[PDB]
């Protein structure tokens, strides 16, 4: 009765002695599996284990008595036998054989055995402790790993994690499917193809392994070759939904299927005579060959008897007679004779069966039969298809006969005698013989094929009439014509069939599809997982059926939230309400209703001034990979053969020198659009607008302020690309010239603003700046004028919240990381593709042309270089698209700087949510970044609104700003920011009388 | 109608019957012909009469 503990984190060893720094480098080989079931075992009163693709073995010894093992596969005398003696510290394996006994074992009561052997092969001598020790044979070889860790724990393994580095190895070369050791608590396991994400040290050791397969997150760390899975919904794999058994569905019956009718004739033609009743246009049932128990003889030629029913035949026959029983074996391909020539001929190529039984006690007569005649001796073979009927006179002689015997005159009409006292080769016999043709036409007579049951909404394939395919059948309501068999769809999909039996109209659908997402938070809040099955019904697969598929692992919530994690038709999952991952309707914001007034309006008195972040990728990796040396690598072979391609190698390169000339041109009109390099005034009297964090600092080696460096830090692998020919060439400006442009254009901000757009820089106080900044989103200079400290406590409040959102989250620089991202590993797979097989024989040209002669090895290279060839023009064409996307962000971020930088752009949503005021460049990699400060009010108040006033007959509407009241007097604001006007006739135009204005309302208008 | 014609091996002949009283020409609508018998017989013919 063997106990079962789990396993935790054991059995992870070096796959291989190729060392790796730093790298989570997944592996998929024989392992043992985590969480399994270990079988430990215990010496009370021996069996062998099965190897199985693995052994994984562990002992305590602390005394040294588990030192000996016994493999082998029949273990009779004759195989060799793995035998590891571990004394005085000396490791001891050969492989000698000896006789077993009864019960072999060695003498150990409570605290060794060997005769002679016979064939000897191979030769080899070298609590407080747990070893280790693996055992597997892969390619003929032998493996041993071991690790020793001092620990203090003997009831159970610990829950930690440790790597076996392997000792020898041992390359027996035999197979091995059984074990057995020999003899205080030891353990065994067994492997398993799994796969893991290892993960290597600085040093190059394993700290940590996952398995792939175990639960969904551990099949999101394997996709995702990370450790650490942040928040969102990943798309691990796909699942299918397997067919049950099979659906095989043929017509059968028919009318009465009438071989009987034929079997049970009541009378026989005579020998010359023999009928053909034609077969055709009926399903063959082929019951009656069964009961061969009545049938004498049962054999074919030219055709496979159990392949009879499993294929068609486009016509059938069956030919009936009765002749003496010793002429079966004469029916035979090859043979000759009278019987063979002048009564039947048989064909080499003959195609049918010949089936004959007793029928002596049926068609014998105790006078004698004289019904069936025929012609004794003929001249030469009869033709084929001929009907011989003919009677002629046989005359051997040149004498003529004048019908009647005579001198050489012999009648050739003889007659039998069928007599009791006859031996066995006169007894009457029944005849019927099958033949079946395969002419130059589509079949018509089908088995029955086994039509067995048909079930319905249950996915399992299916084969009607021919029509084969996987799916699952539902009822339908669709009618069909009577010659129409089978429906269609408009992609020439198949969509209904119709039961051949019953006249039933029947759907075809699909089965399942649909992927396997991995709902998962971050490993920061949480470690649940809740697995969504895209667009599936939730019968074939807690569980709460969504729109968008099956959901696992969270319960519907009847309340309406903020989406955190969309998962598809509105559902969104979240962690939070002990909490638990759910999955509700998403609702986008509070429900709000304002509260929409015949004449009132809600102008803001407050406001706040934000500084948002958006980056906008301008430039990237300018690559320009020669097309020689990365497609082939140095053969004379290959260059030969490239050069066959001609334009796309020189094309290649010409695309994406374009690409590079281009991004350096979208570098040009993103920062170089400042005629002079604007420089920093030593004394900042900015009336406390503080810029230290985003202005350069002198003190800091390059001229990247605060924000940059901390920009550049965030986003990240650096020389590891330009390795095989991915030449990145640098950038025309230097990091540090871009540094100064960024500089250049916010300095120009500052002193300059706008103008410095529009010829030379022209001084203007950053007080002045912003004093027409508020002016251009219809927002009075009074607001800065009145509060332009505060001003500067906000701006200075949201960049410190910048370090925040740069160091706290991991995206707020979402836009360029993935771009710097999906530039590596564009560039990354690029290099992968130099290991793709691409339908060759392998990835290594000097392996080939070493392996093979090159008349094939040619070929080889041709379609591995072919592969090579479309895998760069692929990557080409990835590239030119990115850089379009890449292009139209950089023309973005021009108009950004020229409207918005060099401006004060008035397009809604461009520069940040609000009423934008400036931005101001910070370059990072391969992107460059703005800081929006934009305009938000914040804190609202109800009042009454009236389009125009009418003070002496004549109305009065507001050049700027509807008319608001406090309550008991009128007043004139802006939109943006409650600020009263006592109303005169300097605010308001008159125009037209007062009866056709709508909401007008009587006001007094004060005379200035 | 017999549609004769010996296609991929497989000898098909279509029918539409319909009630109309005039005898002048053909009519001046449209039809469909379903098939009724199918022999696929096959046979090198490229003659008739
Ligand atoms: C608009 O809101 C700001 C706060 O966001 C107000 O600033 C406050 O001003 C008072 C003095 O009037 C100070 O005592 C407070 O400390 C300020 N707030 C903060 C957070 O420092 C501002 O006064 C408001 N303006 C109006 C017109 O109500
Ligand atoms: C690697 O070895 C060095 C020895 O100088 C040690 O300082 C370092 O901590 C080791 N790395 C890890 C991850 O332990
Ligand atoms: C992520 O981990 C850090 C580390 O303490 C923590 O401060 C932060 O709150 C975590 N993120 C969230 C969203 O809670
Ligand atoms: C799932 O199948 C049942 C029948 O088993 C059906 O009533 C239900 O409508 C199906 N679900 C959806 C979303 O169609
Ligand atoms: C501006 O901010 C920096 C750091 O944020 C600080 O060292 C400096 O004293 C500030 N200057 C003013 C004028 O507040
Ligand atoms: C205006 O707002 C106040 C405070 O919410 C409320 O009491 C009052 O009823 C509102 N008046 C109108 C007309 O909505
Ligand atoms: C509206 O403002 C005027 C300004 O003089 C003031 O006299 C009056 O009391 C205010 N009324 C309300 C309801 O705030
Ligand atoms: C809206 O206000 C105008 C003010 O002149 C008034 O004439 C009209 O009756 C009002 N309508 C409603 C529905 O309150
Ligand atoms: C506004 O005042 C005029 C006085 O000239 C009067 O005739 C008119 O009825 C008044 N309308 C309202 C809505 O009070």
């Given at each position: 009765p063997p106990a079962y503990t789990n396993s935790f984190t054991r059995g992870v060893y070096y796959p291989d002695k190729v060392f790796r720094s730093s790298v989570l480098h997944s592996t998929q080989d024989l392992f043992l599996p985590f969480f399994s079931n270990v079988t430990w075992f215990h010496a009370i009163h021996n069996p062998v284990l099965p190897f199985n693709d693995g052994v994984y073995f562990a002992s305590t010894e602390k005394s040294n008595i588990i030192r000996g093992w016994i493999f082998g596969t029949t273990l009779d005398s004759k195989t060799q036998s793995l035998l590891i003696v571990n004394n005085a510290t000396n490791v001891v394996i050969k492989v000698c054989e000896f006789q077993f006994c009864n019960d072999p074992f060695l003498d150990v009561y409570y605290h060794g055995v060997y005769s002679s052997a016979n064939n000897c092969t191979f030769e080899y001598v070298s609590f407080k402790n747990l070893r280790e020790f693996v055992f597997k044979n892969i390619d003929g070889y032998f493996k041993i790993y071991s690790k020793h860790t001092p620990i203090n724990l003997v009831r159970d393994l610990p829950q930690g994690f440790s790597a076996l580095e392997p000792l020898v190895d041992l390359p027996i070369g035999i197979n091995i499917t059984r074990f057995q050791t020999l003899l205080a608590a030891y353990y065994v396991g067994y492997l398993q193809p799994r796969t893991f994400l290892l993960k290597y040290n600085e040093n190059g050791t394993i700290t940590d392994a996952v398995d792939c397969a175990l639960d969904p997150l551990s099949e999101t760390k394997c996709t995702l070759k990370s450790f650490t899975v942040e928040k969102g919904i990943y798309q691990t794999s796909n699942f299918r939904v397997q067919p049950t058994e099979s659906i095989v569905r043929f017509p059968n019956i028919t009318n009465l299927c009438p071989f009987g009718e034929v079997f049970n004739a009541t009378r026989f033609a005579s020998v010359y005579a023999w009928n053909r009743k034609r077969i055709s246009n009926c399903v063959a049932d082929y019951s009656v060959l069964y009961n061969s128990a009545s049938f004498s003889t049962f054999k074919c030629y030219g055709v496979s008897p159990t392949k009879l029913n499993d294929l068609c035949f486009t016509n059938v026959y069956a030919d009936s007679f009765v002749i003496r029983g010793d002429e079966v074996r004469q029916i035979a391909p090859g043979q000759t004779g009278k019987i063979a020539d002048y009564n039947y001929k048989l064909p080499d190529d003959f195609t049918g069966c010949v089936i004959a039984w007793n029928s002596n006690n049926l068609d014998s007569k105790v006078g004698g039969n004289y019904n069936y005649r025929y012609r004794l001796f003929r001249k030469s073979n009869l033709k084929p298809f001929e009907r011989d009927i003919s009677t002629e006179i046989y005359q051997a002689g040149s004498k003529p006969c004048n019908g009647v015997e005579g001198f050489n005159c012999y009648f050739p009409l003889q007659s039998y005698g069928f007599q009791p006292t006859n031996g066995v080769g006169y007894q009457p016999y029944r005849v019927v013989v099958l033949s079946f043709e395969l002419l130059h036409a589509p079949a018509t007579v089908c088995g029955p094929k086994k039509s067995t049951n048909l079930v319905k909404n249950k996915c399992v394939n299916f084969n009607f009439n021919g029509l084969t395919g996987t799916g699952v059948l539902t009822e339908s309501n669709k009618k069909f014509l009577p010659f129409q068999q089978f429906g269609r769809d408009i992609a020439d999909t198949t969509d209904a069939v119709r039961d051949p039996q019953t006249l039933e109209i029947l759907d075809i659908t699909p089965c399942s599809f649909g992927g396997v997402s991995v709902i998962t938070p971050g490993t920061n809040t949480s470690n649940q997982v809740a697995v969504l099955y895209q667009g599936v019904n939730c019968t074939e697969v807690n569980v709460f059926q969504t729109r968008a598929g099956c959901l696992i692992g969270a319960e519907h919530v009847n309340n309406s939230y903020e989406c955190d994690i969309p998962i598809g038709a509105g559902i969104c999952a979240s962690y939070q309400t002990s909490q638990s991952i759910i999955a509700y309707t998403m609702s986008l914001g509070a429900e709000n209703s304002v509260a929409y007034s015949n004449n009132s309006i809600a102008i803001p008195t407050n406001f706040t001034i934000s500084v948002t972040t958006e980056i906008l990728?301008?430039?990237?990796?300018?690559?320009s990979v020669d097309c020689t040396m990365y497609i082939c690598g140095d053969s004379t072979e290959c260059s030969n053969l490239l050069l066959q391609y001609g334009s796309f190698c020189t094309q290649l390169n010409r695309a994406l020198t374009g690409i590079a000339v281009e991004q350096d041109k979208n570098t040009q009109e993103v920062f170089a659009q400042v005629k002079q390099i604007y420089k920093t005034p030593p004394?900042?009297?900015?009336?406390?607008?503080?810029f230290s964090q985003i202005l350069p600092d002198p003190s800091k080696p390059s001229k990247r302020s605060f924000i940059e460096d901390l920009l550049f830090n965030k986003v990240t692998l650096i020389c590891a690309q330009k390795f095989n020919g991915l030449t990145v060439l640098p950038p025309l400006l230097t990091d540090e010239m871009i540094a100064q442009y960024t500089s250049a254009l916010l300095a120009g901000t500052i002193t300059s603003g706008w103008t410095f757009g529009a010829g030379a820089a022209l001084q203007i106080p950053f007080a002045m700046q912003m004093a027409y900044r508020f002016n251009g989103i219809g927002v009075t200079q009074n607001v800065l004028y009145e509060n332009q400290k505060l001003i500067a406590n906000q701006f200075n409040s949201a960049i410190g919240k910048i370090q925040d959102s740069l160091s706290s989250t991991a995206s707020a620089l979402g836009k360029l990381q993935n771009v710097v991202n999906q530039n590596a590993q564009a560039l990354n797979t690029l290099v992968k593709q130099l290991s793709s097989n691409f339908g060759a024989i392998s990835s290594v040209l000097n392996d080939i042309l070493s392996r093979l002669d090159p008349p094939e090895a040619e070929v080889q290279i041709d379609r591995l270089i072919t592969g090579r060839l479309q895998s760069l023009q692929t990557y080409v064409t990835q590239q030119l698209i990115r850089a379009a996307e890449i292009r139209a962000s950089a023309n973005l971020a021009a108009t950004k700087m020229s409207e918005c930088v060099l401006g004060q752009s008035k397009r809604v949503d461009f520069c940040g949510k609000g009423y934008h005021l400036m931005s101001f460049p910070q370059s990072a990699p391969h992107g460059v970044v703005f800081l929006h400060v934009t305009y938000v009010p914040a804190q609202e108040k109800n009042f009454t609104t009236a389009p125009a006033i009418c003070h002496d007959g004549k109305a009065h509407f507001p050049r700027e700003g509807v008319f608001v009241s406090n309550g008991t007097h009128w007043f004139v604001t802006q939109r943006n920011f409650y600020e009263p006007q006592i109303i005169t006739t300097d605010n308001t135009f008159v125009s037209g009388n007062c009866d056709v204005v709508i909401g007008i309302v009587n006001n007094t208008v004060y005379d200035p």
């Open positions: 990728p301008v430039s990237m990796t300018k690559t004394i900042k009297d900015f009336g406390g607008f503080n």
